[PDB]
Structure formats: C-alpha cells, structure tokens
Motif scaffolding. Structure first.
Motif, short mmCIF file in Angstrom:
data_model
loop_
_atom_site.label_atom_id
_atom_site.label_comp_id
_atom_site.label_asym_id
_atom_site.label_seq_id
_atom_site.Cartn_x
_atom_site.Cartn_y
_atom_site.Cartn_z
N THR B 178 0.82 -1.16 0.00
CA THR B 178 0.00 0.00 0.00
C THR B 178 0.89 1.25 0.00
O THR B 178 2.08 1.18 0.31
CB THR B 178 -0.96 -0.04 1.18
OG1 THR B 178 -0.22 -0.11 2.38
CG2 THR B 178 -1.88 -1.31 1.10
N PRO B 179 0.33 2.40 -0.41
CA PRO B 179 1.00 3.69 -0.20
C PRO B 179 1.32 3.94 1.27
O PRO B 179 2.30 4.60 1.59
CB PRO B 179 -0.03 4.70 -0.70
CG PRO B 179 -0.88 3.92 -1.66
CD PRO B 179 -0.97 2.56 -1.10
N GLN B 180 0.46 3.42 2.15
CA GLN B 180 0.70 3.48 3.58
C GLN B 180 1.95 2.68 3.95
O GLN B 180 2.84 3.22 4.61
CB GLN B 180 -0.52 2.99 4.34
CG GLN B 180 -0.48 3.19 5.89
CD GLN B 180 0.01 4.56 6.30
OE1 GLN B 180 -0.48 5.57 5.80
NE2 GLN B 180 1.02 4.60 7.20
N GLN B 181 2.04 1.42 3.53
CA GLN B 181 3.32 0.73 3.77
C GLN B 181 4.52 1.39 3.10
O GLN B 181 5.55 1.49 3.75
CB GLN B 181 3.34 -0.77 3.53
CG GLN B 181 2.52 -1.33 2.44
CD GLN B 181 1.88 -2.67 2.85
OE1 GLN B 181 1.80 -3.00 4.05
NE2 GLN B 181 1.44 -3.46 1.88
N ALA B 182 4.39 1.90 1.87
CA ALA B 182 5.52 2.63 1.24
C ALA B 182 5.93 3.80 2.13
O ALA B 182 7.07 3.92 2.51
CB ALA B 182 5.20 3.13 -0.17
N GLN B 183 4.95 4.62 2.50
CA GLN B 183 5.19 5.81 3.32
C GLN B 183 5.92 5.48 4.66
O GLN B 183 6.89 6.14 5.03
CB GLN B 183 3.87 6.55 3.54
CG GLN B 183 3.89 7.66 4.56
CD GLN B 183 4.96 8.71 4.30
OE1 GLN B 183 5.34 8.98 3.14
NE2 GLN B 183 5.44 9.34 5.39
N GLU B 184 5.50 4.42 5.32
CA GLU B 184 6.04 4.11 6.64
C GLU B 184 7.44 3.56 6.54
O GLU B 184 8.24 3.79 7.46
CB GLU B 184 5.08 3.22 7.45
CG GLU B 184 5.34 1.77 7.32
CD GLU B 184 4.36 0.93 8.11
OE1 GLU B 184 4.54 -0.33 8.06
OE2 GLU B 184 3.44 1.53 8.77
N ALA B 185 7.76 2.85 5.46
CA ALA B 185 9.17 2.50 5.20
C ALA B 185 10.01 3.75 4.99
O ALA B 185 11.09 3.93 5.57
CB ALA B 185 9.30 1.60 3.96
N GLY B 211 9.59 -0.58 -5.01
CA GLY B 211 8.73 -1.74 -5.12
C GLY B 211 8.06 -1.61 -6.46
O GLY B 211 8.36 -0.71 -7.21
N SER B 212 7.11 -2.47 -6.74
CA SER B 212 6.46 -2.49 -8.02
C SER B 212 5.79 -1.14 -8.40
O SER B 212 4.71 -0.83 -7.91
CB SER B 212 5.42 -3.63 -8.01
OG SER B 212 5.16 -4.11 -9.32
N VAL B 213 6.42 -0.34 -9.27
CA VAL B 213 5.77 0.88 -9.79
C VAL B 213 5.39 0.82 -11.28
O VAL B 213 6.18 0.39 -12.15
CB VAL B 213 6.52 2.21 -9.34
CG1 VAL B 213 8.00 1.97 -9.05
CG2 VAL B 213 6.29 3.39 -10.27
N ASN B 214 4.15 1.24 -11.54
CA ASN B 214 3.57 1.31 -12.88
C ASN B 214 2.83 2.63 -13.06
O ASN B 214 2.68 3.41 -12.12
CB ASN B 214 2.61 0.12 -13.12
CG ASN B 214 1.47 0.09 -12.12
OD1 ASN B 214 0.74 1.06 -11.97
ND2 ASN B 214 1.31 -1.03 -11.45
N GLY B 215 2.33 2.85 -14.27
CA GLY B 215 1.74 4.13 -14.63
C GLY B 215 0.50 4.40 -13.83
O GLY B 215 0.18 5.56 -13.59
N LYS B 216 -0.18 3.33 -13.38
CA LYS B 216 -1.43 3.44 -12.63
C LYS B 216 -1.25 3.79 -11.15
O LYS B 216 -1.96 4.63 -10.63
CB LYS B 216 -2.26 2.16 -12.76
CG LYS B 216 -2.96 2.00 -14.11
CD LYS B 216 -1.97 1.77 -15.26
CE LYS B 216 -1.65 3.01 -16.09
NZ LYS B 216 -0.36 2.83 -16.91
N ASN B 217 -0.29 3.18 -10.45
CA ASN B 217 -0.11 3.45 -9.00
C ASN B 217 0.81 4.65 -8.68
O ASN B 217 0.80 5.15 -7.56
CB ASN B 217 0.44 2.21 -8.30
CG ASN B 217 1.75 1.81 -8.84
OD1 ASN B 217 2.27 2.50 -9.72
ND2 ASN B 217 2.34 0.72 -8.33
N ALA B 218 1.61 5.09 -9.65
CA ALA B 218 2.68 6.03 -9.36
C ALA B 218 2.23 7.37 -8.72
O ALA B 218 2.90 7.89 -7.86
CB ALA B 218 3.54 6.28 -10.61
#
Lengths: 249, 249
Positions: B178-185, B211-218
C-alpha cells in the motif's frame, strides 16, 4: 603446423576512450600477412567504441564475461544482449572471475555451454595457481576444470570452443614460465581432449597460452607444438600487442 | 517541501538496440514541465547508445553497477571507466546483486563510498525480502543496511546520495505494498537519517520508492510525504514510464 592461431587482447577492467581509441587505430594500422584471428575483449562499456572504430579484417570483438539470459539481473550483461550488439566472441571462466566473483567450475561450464548454444565463439579459461602448481596439483586442477566444461558440451560444440591455459602461477610470482612448461601444459590439455573427446577435435582445437605474454617472449612461446596463440593481459594494452600477433606467423 | 524528485529507469539486464532506441526517443519526446531528474540505468553495453541517443534536458544516464577501481578485474566495469565515459550516476546495492553477486552490506557501502568520493550521484538501494518482513525484521534489516552505508560516509557526501527503498517483499509475491506501507518505510528511513546524520540532511534527501511501480499506481505513491520518486523496474522498459515521470509533479 597448426590450426588458425588466435591473438586475443584481454583488456580486463581498463581503458579510457582516448587511450583505447589510439590503440584500436594502431591495431587497424597493422599489416598481418598470415591467417590469424585477432580478438579484442574490452569492457562492456567499450564494446560500442571498439566495434565502431576497429575496422581490421583480422579482428573481432569479444566480451570478457556474461550471464546466460536477459532479465532481472541488475548490473549484469547477458548473451542475447551481446548477440544483439553484434558481439560473437566471449571470454569465459577467467581466473579473476573464478577467484573473485564466485565462478566455480560448474558456473563457468554452464556459461560456456550457454554461449556455445547461442552461437558464440568461446575462449574458455582454465589453469592453476602457484600454490596448486607447487603442491603437484597442476594436472588435477586443469583437467578437472576442462572435464567440468566438456561434460556440458557435445562433439558439434567444439567448433566453437577455444581453450586458454592461464598459467596464473607464472604471473607476477617470481616464476617465469619456459616454452617447455607452456608446451608441457598445452600437451597435457590436448592429450586429454584427444583421449576424452577425440583426436580430430583435439587436432582442430586452439589452445591459447594466457600466462604472462609480451612482445619479447611470444614467438618462442608460440613456436611450441601445442601453443596456438595467446590470451594477453597487460601487454594487450600496449603497442607490443602487434609483435605478439606477428609472433603467431 | 520535498526536494527534487527522481524518476529512475532500471532497465536491469534487458534491451535490444532497436527496442531501446525506440524507448529513448519516446523519452526524448516527453514534455516535462516540472523539476525532476530522470535517470536511465541501462546495461553497460547500452550506455554508449543511451548517451548518444538520449537528448532530453531532464535525463541523465546511470550504470547499474561498478567496482571501485580499474585493473585486473576481468568482466567488471570500474568507476574511473564510467567517469571517463561521462557516466555520473550509478545504482548501487540493488537487491539482485545482494542476492546473487555477493554484495553484503559492507560491499555495497564500500562501493557507495568509493562512487561518492569519485563524484558520482549514487542511488543506493536498501530493502527487505518477503520473509524478512513477515518475521518482523523490516526496521532491523533496512536500518542495518543504511547504517552500514552511512558509517562509511561523511556529512558533505550526502548531497550525492539517493536512497532507493526496494520493497522486494511486494514484487511478485502476492503481498501488496500500500502507499501506507511505502510511506512508513520511507518515514522510518528519513527518521533514521534525521536522527543519525541530521535533520538538514534528511530534509534534502531523495528517498525513492522501488517496489512495483507502474503508470497506474505512481501518482498515488508519489503523493506520500516521504516519497521522492521511483526506481522503476519492468515498467521502465515501457511507455508508461512517461506517466511515472508525470506522477512526480
């Protein structure tokens, strides 16, 4: 007389664009009056400049390493990549990669076989350290390394195989290798191939001397019955590399 | 405010001359209206063309690995070589090299220290595996890895340091970052930096999500407070890498 000799330059992890440009042009300037395949194994970075700037009909370019397939292997270069780049020659198993970078006998053999399957001409390196020579393990080590490689190949494969005998024991150790010692090692390897792959493969095989080779020692090395040319280290970064090629006449 | 974002393409061990050429010209075609460093990390082999063919003002080229010095290191590429080639960015300590090619925390740190000393901009990669995360060792591992790096650096060095947080645990595993897990790392990281190196360093530091980045989640990943861009793998070989750049706006 002999199979076509090879004069192979192992530049290792060396060169600048200017240094290498000048050497390439010196190579281009050479008049080679005999059949010899010359090979320049530059760093990956330099493969483009070398490919473009080296125009000599007797020279090909090689990589100093690869992994078998493309993909998620950051930092590494693969065989299909080299192939797409027009690199058809490759040095595999160099003592330095075996020493530093985890290349066991099997890892080397697998890389050789992958390169052979993908169409590469392969310079497969084997050879023993000073410690191995001094403990009487020259034949054990060298024949072990080549057995590991050969069990991954089949007869047809050997058309694309060159074996470089790196006399590591003879590089910077006090021990300067005689033509006889060179010959004795090359003879050992050729007899093995004859006995294990066959006398026709053994007769066609190029076995390159990859101890310390320079302008001074090359001819008397080359003249030995089973020496088919050279994999040259430091001298290959110098003008005398020309005299090393000339020494293969 | 956030420091300048970085959109970095890790092509890993992929690309052909034709495929990469088309991708480079797409990258050239992009119109980027905000301040962002785009970096393209190609294989060593592709560095010449990328350098020659990429002409966009927001792009720089990077290597995916190096060793510290030139010399008798068959198959490797050194930092001085890269420097002489005009390569001033480098990705160091990628998960794959730690996993496959012997790069311990110390080895990565040493490479990072040498690259920084050499004048490189360094994308230093850290991150834990799926099973490190599920054993509760995210902070142990990640902060262990950055500490190993930081102890070999000095304050002024950090202006040339980028941290990429590789969420290895989230790539191809079924586990969803999640963006939440990305943020907390990322927050763990910047906190550590703030507390161990200084709040001024930590405010300037680019911590890239890898981690896995694509045009949709970035875009959603970018809008997290502690995310300063991306080290993109698979998606970086594709058109949507442009959308990933756009998302750092």
């Amino acid at each position: 007389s002999k199979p076509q000799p090879i004069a192979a330059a192992n530049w290792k992890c060396n060169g600048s664009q200017q240094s290498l440009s000048e050497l390439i042009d010196l190579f281009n300037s050479t008049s080679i009056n005999h059949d010899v395949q010359c090979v320049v194994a530059s760093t990956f970075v330099h493969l483009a400049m070398t490919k473009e700037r080296l125009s000599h009909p007797k020279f090909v370019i090689a990589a100093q390493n690869a992994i078998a397939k493309s993909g998620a292997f950051t930092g590494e270069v693969s065989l299909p990549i080299l192939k797409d780049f027009g690199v058809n020659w490759i040095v595999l198993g160099h003592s330095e990669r075996r020493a530093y970078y985890g290349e066991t006998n099997e890892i080397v053999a697998d890389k050789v076989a992958a390169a052979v399957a993908s169409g590469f001409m392969v310079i497969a390196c084997i050879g023993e350290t000073l410690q191995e020579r001094e403990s009487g393990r020259t034949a054990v080590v060298v024949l072990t390394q080549i057995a590991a490689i050969a069990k991954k190949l089949k007869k047809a494969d050997w058309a694309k195989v060159v074996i470089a005998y790196e006399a590591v024991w003879a590089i910077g150790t006090g021990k300067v290798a005689t033509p006889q010692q060179a010959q004795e090692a090359h003879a050992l390897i050729r007899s093995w191939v004859s006995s294990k792959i066959g006398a026709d493969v053994a007769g066609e095989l190029r076995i390159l001397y990859g101890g310390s080779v320079n302008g001074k020692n090359a001819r008397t090395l080359y003249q030995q019955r089973d020496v088919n040319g050279f994999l040259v280290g430091g001298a290959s970064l110098k003008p005398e590399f020309v005299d090393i090629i000339k020494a293969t006449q």
